[PDB]
Structures are given as C-alpha cells and as structure tokens.
Design a protein around this ligand. Structure first.
Ligand SMILES: [Cl-]
Ligand SMILES: [Cl-]
Ligand code: NA
Ligand SMILES: [Zn+2]
Ligand SMILES: [Zn+2]
Ligand SMILES: [Zn+2]
Ligand SMILES: [Zn+2]
Ligand SMILES: [Zn+2]
Ligand SMILES: [Zn+2]
Lengths: 76, 320, 75, 76, 323, 75
C-alpha cells in the first residue's frame, strides 16, 4: 500500500509499505529518499506519536493514510 | 426558536446554554439526525437523553422544553467525580466539552490505540483540533520532542486578547494572543529563547474558542467583546496549518456562550432568519441582524463570553 | 523538578513539583502563587483536563511541561 | 534465547530473545523491563554499536551474550 | 632463547627487529602462535609464513644471529600501496607492532558481516586488544553524549601528561597515574551546554592479558626522557587504567612490565625480562646483552643512553595462551 | 565544522575544517598550529590511523570529533 509521509516544509512523501512494516522500517524508507537519520525522526498519526517497535497494523494505519514527519534533533 | 426550563433550585443554565448551541449548529444537528446507533448506557445514557431532547426540539409545539433528562444522565455518568451533580451549579464550557467527549465514547469502536477513525463521529470529524507543540530554535537548529494531542476547545487568555488588540484578520490576533507567555529557552541551551509552536494537522469545520478569565467580575469584559471578530481564517489561528482545506478555510462567528453572575446565556445566529438570537434558559428574545447589537447587549449586562463558536460556511455533516 | 503553568493572565509561573504529587497538591501550590482557590481551577495538559485524584505521573508530566490554568465559572 | 544487558550502574537486565529479533526489538524489551525510551538507548557489543534495523544473528550474538546499554540523555 | 637479528647497512630493519623480539619473548604470544596450524596464506609473500620461519629459527637454529629479511620483504609487499614498511626505509616500531598484530588477525580470523572478531585463535583480539567506548557525561545536569565504541591494540598517552601527573602524585598507583595522565586534556563542554564542563570518560569492556602502552613523545631528542623513565612503573592494575573497567577478569588483573621498545638517534632497540634467567635482556639488532635482574639496571642504561621508551608491554603473569 | 585534536603534550586544540578536507589538509592545519611536520604526524580516530588520500567524510569525522595525534619516530 502507498502511504503518504508529510513534512513541515510541505513535501508530501509517498512510500510503498505493507502493514507488517514497523515504524522503524518506515523511517528507514524515509532515509532512503531524504537522508534523515531515523534517530532524528518522529512520526505522528491522528495526534499519536508512533513507536519504532510497533507496526502500522498496530495503529490501524490503512492504505492512503497521511503521516506527519517531525524531526527531533540537537543543535550545532 | 424554543427555550429551556430551570426550576428554582435546578441550577441548570450551564447545560441549557450548551444545549442550545449544539441544537443550532447545522453541522452537529444534521449530523446527529443521521445517527441511529450508539453505545447505550441504559438510564445514565447521555445519548438517549440528548436524543430525546432533539426529538422535542423538532416535533414538539411548546415554547419551553425540559432538559432534566440530560441533567440526570450527566449527573449519573459523572457521579464518581462529583461533576454536573443534580442541583449544584457547574461550568458551561466544561459541560460543552464533556458532552463532546461523551458523544465520541458512544460512537466509537474503542480502538485499542485510542485513535478515532469513525466517519460518523461528529466530535472528532468536525470539531476536534489535532495539533502538536514543539520548540524549534532557528539559530542553532535544535528542536524539542514534539508533543501531539487533540483538543476540543482552544483556550486563550483574556488579558492577552485585549493587550494584543491594543497592539478583518483577528485570526492573527488570536494566534498572537495565545502565544504571549510561551517564551522558552532553546532545547539545547545555545543561549537563544524561542516561542512554542503549534501546528494543526486536520481540518475542523467548527472551531470553538475558549476565553480564559481572570475573575467572575472581570473589568476586561467590555474590551474583550470589542476585540472579537466575526470572520476567522483558520490558516492564521496557528503557527502552521498542514491541511490545505484549513489553509484556505474562513469561519464565521455563529454562536457564543456568556457568563454573568453565576448564570449562563447563549447568543446564536439563526441563519433561517439572518438575525442573532438570545436564549437565557426559558427567556428567548431577538437581537437583530447586525452583530453590533450583540455587542451592545453584552456590554450593557457585563457579560463574559466563555465559549465562541466559529463554523465553516461551506461545511458538511458526517457522511456514510 | 520544575513545571510551567500558564496563568489566567497569559503569563507563565514555575512550580516545584514531584511526579507522585496529586493534582490537588498542584492546585494548592497554584493557590499560593496565583491566589485562585482549587475549586475554581481547571488544569489542562495536552488537551485533557486533569481529574482531581490522579498524580502528575499518571498524565506523563515530566520536567518543563506546561499546564494551562483555566478559571471554572460555575453558573 | 537468554541474553544479558549490562547497564552502566552494573544492573543486569535478563532478556528472552530470538536470533531473528532486531535491535529495535531488543530496545523495546528493555523498555518493557525498565521504562527506558528506545530513543535514549544505545547498545554496544564487541566494540560495535548495534544498528536498529539489523538483527542479533547479524552480529553473531549467541546465548548468554552480554550487551552493554549506554544512554543518551538530554539532561536538565 | 636469546638470539639477535641481523641488520645490514642500508636495510634499516631495527624497527622490525625490535618488534620481533617483543613478540618472540612474550609468552602469551609465542606459545599461542606455536599452537597455530592453519592460516589464511597470502602466497610467496605472506607475513604469517615469514613470521613462522623466523620463530622456528629462534628455537631450532644454533646461530647467535638470525635474519628477519623474509618478514621485512613480506611486510613491504603487503603495504606497498600504503607506502609503509618499505625496503631500505626507516619506519616506526609501534606502527610496525600494531600492524603485525592487525595482520595476524587477518591471517587467523574470517571476514564477518559486521567486522566482529570472535575467533578464539586470534591472539590479537583475544589477548592484546582493548574494547572501549568514549562518552561525555555531565554529573550536574545529567546530559550524556552518544557513546563512541572502538577497539585499539595500543593505548597512547602523552609523555608530558605523564611527567606532570607524576609531580602531582609526589607502585600500586601507576595504573591511576596512567589514567589521570591520559585524561588530562579531555575537558569538553556539557553535551547540552548547562554551563558546566566535563571530562571525556573511557570505559573498557573486555579483559586483555597484554596491555601495550604507547608513549606520545614531543620530540625525537626529548629532554623529558629521564623524567619519563623515572615515572614508569613495573606493575599495572588494569582496573585503574581506565575510568571504568566493566569486566570482572580485568578488575582483578595485575600486569607486570616485561618488555619495552626504545627509540634513540633514529634507531630502535628492546629490553625484555626473560622469566627463565630471571634477568633483563637487551636486544639491539645483532647485539644481545645482559643488563641485570633489577629494573634500576634498565633505568640506568636508558638514562645514560637517553633512550626514549615508545612501547611498554605489560603481561598478566596469570595469563593463558589461546585455547 | 569544528573538530578537536589531542596534541603531543596532552593539550586539546580546535581545528576549523570541512568534511571534504583531506587529512593531508588537516595535517597542514596541525603543522601551522602545533609545529609538527606532516610526515611525523600520526592521526588516530576511534582507534584507527587515518591514511593520506582520504577525507574526513570518508572516516565519518563529524563536528566535536577528536583526533589523537601521535608522533612518528622513524628508526
Ligand atoms: Cl630511510
Ligand atoms: Cl578508577
Ligand atoms: Na529507532
Ligand atoms: Zn442510549
Ligand atoms: Zn471520536
Ligand atoms: Zn538554539
Ligand atoms: Zn602463509
Ligand atoms: Zn581478530
Ligand atoms: Zn550539563
């Protein structure tokens, strides 16, 4: 299923994923297309922050769902 | 237009004020009519009490209607926390907020992750604000851990709405006001200080604003009514708005709950008559077409608006 | 551990708390700073209102979290 | 499989895992026993940092192997 | 057995002969290497094969002096692209020592997907290598940096840091002295900038049975040599060598100085305590000499010759060869 | 980009550098600050010696990284 990851700059990422894919794998796929280290990534869906251990199926994240990518990083 | 009854010791104008708003918002009413399924609580069921009141609002020919069926379902549902109890005086915004929550609890399949996806849930599909808070330092790059949550009402301080007014586009006024005391140190302590950012992620078609008050006898009342705007651009209420529908969404002031001396009232725009209306429990009265009259009625009675309700003119009820 | 509270004036005060503190305790400390009795105090954190009886840890209130104080208007 | 996780205070976390468990999977078990968020967790074995997306058998981590848990904390 | 290694005018092999003497005289290495039958051979040029031929001569030959030219040649061909250890060119004994240990691993172990040596026959990783991680930790605010793990065969410490920390202290303290010297300049800011300062912390997670200390010199004619020699201790407590020592075998480990590669005047030589004769030997290529049974005898010679110790080898006397 | 170099004397210095900088470029900056000629410079990062012809990016040298300088003594 193609899921949509939306970033703060406005870029709407599209990824081919399956419900088995853990949030860590979604973060990996994101790194394959943006170069953002998963340790700096935080995913958000329906106001809930998704955990890397859980999987899309655990959140009922159906196809064509839009996810929100917020980055938690340090300075300098 | 109809009215609601309060016995001498009933002390129920908090419910009645909120009951009028829900009945008059076209989005909530037209949605609620296409609902024939709910997790009934039996006797302490808010849905069935609510339902019963909406049937009489549409079919009954009486000028004043009883709301004790909702007062008991509210008192029994919240008997463990001693809120909205039978006879006691309570908060209207609290009542308006817990009513929306209790509705969702009745129209949801209790998702384990607690997400709400129900296409028919009015409380989440039409009213709820899904956003997140985050501290972003633009000088060194640092960024706090994002805090996401859902709120049903956006609360803004009165001392801040007025001050920003002293300092057409009152969405920026609300955003500038809501972020007044939100200065924080940079998450990595680079020396810079930033403001907390909130960005909305969905597209609510009814935006309900809460006004935080300083006392039951506020001297900012008159100035607060003078700073209110009728047209609210959703694209400016928050630091950022992700959904495009919200980006171009303009919402009009449609209803409002007012407090005055341990009592509650409700002003509302009946679009079927193009005139603002007034509901003090059982006493109904017409105000006029111009919003300026609502202002004059309010500053003449020292009213304190507690809840402001903005509706998308091009809104839609819930869909199958 | 310190905590941020957004008062009715729109300003922020700092409260010294521990996560095992009930919110009636947090409400009492707010009363010593802002002068609002706890019965008129509505405390909102991340959208939900803090129901009296729980502790700060039951809502995952860590250090530097910001509570939104709201005046209850019984009518 | 029983593997052990050494904290820098000397506490030992015993974990029941499979060779096919990923590192994010192991960090989730550590959170179940300790409440340590996975984003704070760094795991070290044989002088190498363990990558979230790779498995225990990738690093040839066997029974009774000892992993070292080092934490990244923001502080304050 | 104490034999010499030939060095002809121009071949500049004293840096290799100095390292070779350490490896042959280190009990945990020599006994381990003898039990090693199979190896990843590189062909006619192969360090393991040249090393074995040298070690077999050290035991079976009756000649007072032996040639290292086979290992010299194999080292040159192995590092031709790096332009190191080339024929006829001087080089560094500690670099030579390090790379011999590294290539021994390449000859003994197998390529793992994650570059993790677990082979019980690898002398370098099983007995020499130190497995560490570095981290910045602030005690005041609790902030911690990302841990940086790595493996090293030699622990390098500055000679000026060593001499200075010796004056501050003015046996059974040499480990703490080495640790305070190594950490002297490792002051950094808090990972989160609370305003306080921190010291880089090094944590040893394994248990080497041979610790190779490398002295970082300021000059090739150092005027700190005498103070360095007088600052060196003969007993190392491994549990004190690093800020944290997490392995129980290493907390209890006590290692004694048994070898020392020395630099002077663009030349290299080696002192070593033969546990049999109970005396300190000295190997300068072909010249083998009896220094004496007391460490002071080595001190007197090093100070008189202005010798600059480069590699110190501390061996656990309760250590064991590879299984 | 800022990196640290632990020098021969145990002191820590600061190198202003770019990820695309060859380590021979880094060795030249060390020569100007510390006076050690390049052929006598041994740069160790994470236990491994940096070999000429590579850049800081090749070794994942990032900001606040520390290089350990050892003096080479040819003999
Ligand atoms: Cl030469
Ligand atoms: Cl210690
Ligand atoms: Na992760
Ligand atoms: Zn019902
Ligand atoms: Zn809902
Ligand atoms: Zn900053
Ligand atoms: Zn061979
Ligand atoms: Zn090895
Ligand atoms: Zn700190």
């Amino acid at each position: 299923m193609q899921i949509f990851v939306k970033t703060l700059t406005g870029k709407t990422i599209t990824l081919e994923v399956e419900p088995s894919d853990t949030i860590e794998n979604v973060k990996a796929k994101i790194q394959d297309k943006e170069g953002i280290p998963p340790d700096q990534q935080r995913l958000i869906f329906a106001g809930k922050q998704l955990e890397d251990g859980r999987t899309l199926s655990d959140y009922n994240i159906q196809r064509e769902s839009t996810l929100h990518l917020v980055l938690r990083l340090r300075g300098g | 237009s109809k009215g609601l009854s309060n016995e001498p010791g009933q002390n129920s104008c908090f419910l009645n004020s909120a009951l009028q708003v829900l009945w008059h918002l076209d989005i909530f009413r037209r949605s609620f009519r296409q609902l024939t399924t709910h997790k009934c609580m039996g006797d302490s069921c808010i849905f069935c009490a609510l339902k019963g009141i909406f049937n009489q609002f549409q079919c009954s020919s009486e000028k004043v209607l009883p709301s004790d069926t909702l007062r008991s379902a509210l008192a029994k549902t919240f008997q463990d926390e001693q809120r909205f109890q039978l006879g006691i005086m309570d908060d209207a915004a609290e009542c308006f907020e817990n009513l929306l929550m209790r509705i969702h609890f009745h129209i949801a399949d209790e998702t384990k992750e607690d997400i709400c996806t129900a296409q028919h849930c009015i409380s989440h599909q039409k009213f709820a604000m899904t956003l997140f808070e985050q501290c972003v330092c633009t000088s060194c790059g640092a960024t706090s851990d994002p805090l996401p949550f859902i709120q049903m009402v956006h609360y803004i301080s009165t001392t801040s709405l007025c001050n920003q007014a002293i300092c057409s586009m009152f969405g920026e006024l609300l955003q500038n006001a809501s972020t007044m005391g939100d200065l924080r140190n940079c998450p990595s302590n680079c020396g810079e200080r930033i403001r907390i950012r909130r960005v909305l992620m969905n597209a609510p078609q009814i935006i309900t604003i809460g006004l935080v008050w300083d006392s039951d006898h506020s001297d900012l009342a008159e100035d607060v009514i003078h700073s209110l705007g009728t047209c609210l651009k959703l694209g400016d209420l928050f630091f950022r708005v992700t959904d495009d529908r919200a980006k171009q969404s303009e919402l009009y002031l449609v209803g409002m709950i007012c407090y005055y001396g341990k009592h509650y009232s409700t002003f509302f725009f009946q679009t079927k008559i193009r005139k603002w209306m007034y509901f003090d429990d059982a006493h109904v009265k017409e105000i006029g077409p111009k919003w300026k009259d609502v202002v004059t009625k309010c500053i003449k009675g020292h009213y304190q608006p507690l809840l402001l309700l903005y509706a998308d003119p091009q809104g839609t009820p819930v869909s199958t």
